[PDB]
Design goal:
Interacts with host TRAF6; this interaction inhibits host NF-kappa-B pathway. Interacts with NS5B; this interaction enhances RNA-dependent RNA polymerase activity. Interacts with protein NS4A. It is a single chain. The protein is of the alpha/beta class. It has 15 helices and 21 strands. The chain folds into three domains: 190 residues, no CATH class; 166 residues, Rossmann fold; 127 residues, no CATH class. The strands form six sheets. The protein has a six-stranded parallel beta sheet. A hairpin with a 2-residue loop joins strand 18 and strand 19. Helix 5 packs across helix 9. The chain starts with a helix and ends with a helix.
Amino acid sequence: ATDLTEMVKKITTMNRGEFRQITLATGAGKTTELPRSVIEEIGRHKRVLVLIPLRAAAESVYQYMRQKHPSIAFNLRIGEMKEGDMATGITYASYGYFCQMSQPKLRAAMVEYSFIFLDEYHCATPEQLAIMGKIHRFSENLRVVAMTATPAGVTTTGQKHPIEEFIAPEVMKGEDLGSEYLDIAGLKIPVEEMKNNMLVFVPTRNMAVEAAKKLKAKGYNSGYYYPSNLRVVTSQSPYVVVATNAIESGVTLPDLDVVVDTGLKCEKRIRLSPKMPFIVTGLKRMAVTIGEQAQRRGRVGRVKPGRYYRSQETPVGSKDYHYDLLQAQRYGIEDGINITKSFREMNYDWSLYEEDSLMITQLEILNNLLISEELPMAVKYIMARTDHPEPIQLAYNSYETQVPVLFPKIRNGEVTDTYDNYTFLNARKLGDDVPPYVYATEDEDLAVELLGLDWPDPGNQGTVEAGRALKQVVGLSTAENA
């Protein structure tokens, strides 16, 4: 914390229009003690903002801090826009709170803070990405500090005992392995490890259940997660629990010995092409980050020494924020702002994320299309009220169709007579008439293929031109390759 005085002195000497990126653990007083030291240095009646991804996390820090430091004023902004707000202490807000204001309102609000702390920036949530790109637009008027706990790689964790690291080989097409090894999540693990308390990390919800039943069939005390039910399994040692990445999220495992990590996870990803639909989104099995691998390994070696079995799968450096960046675009529609351009411009100055230039380029071309015309009021309303998980799909598609279509759900790899229905859409079923979608889902595309149907081609100048622009951009990437 001697080094905290250094950080504080560096932050507090900052001039308007300046930026600092800081790396320090959560238990090192990031989110908390840093902004506290800064306000104590600059004056308690000055205003300092701390942006937190989760509303819950914001409220939790607010409570903790106001009780721990009663001489410093504290504010919480996770609800409705507090008009003309001028609260003097430290304000703990969510990025989503500032997403309610127009650019001018946002700027007027933001310039009134002496310092702006962007907490947990590599979570890269859509609200986070939109706010950072948006405020960067007037960064000359601000003093901003981006804080992180564990940046791009092992990583920073709560280890107290040593962890034995192992590389488990992948199981080969029905290989024999009797009385010595067992197949758990596609990995060859010694049967001796079943005498210990196990946690198995798996990507899909289906894999977590399928491997749990196979282990119970083999006579092991197995469970699955994707908490009271596991509590039952967890009471008897030895236990094996097959859980998704969602396991870590406040669920307890008593006296855990061994972790088996498949190295995989299921996340939303995007594909872009010059052929319409230019955008197709869907869940996809991918590799976990070095940070996520460290979180998985970190579940052991806390109270007793651990054992970590990992797959041959190599972890990725940074998280893939392209899907969240696409979702973030929604926050510039009313203002006529290209969120993709703002992100790119902010990142150039702040150097917070790794970049995929072809993808940013394509996302930016499409973003220009998204804001090329005022959104129909009808669409604005649906997007505001639907429980549809990706309302921006509605905004993009409106450049071709105003009628949402219901594509038959895909169970296994086959087309069902099941449909997904969300509120306010007032949709029609696919039938055999494929809509001219600019933005589609992996499954909407699959149904189209399985049914032997075809996606229409650009029906207007703007859409035809976005396609040609995308084709041109891809042409260079391909030509550059060799």
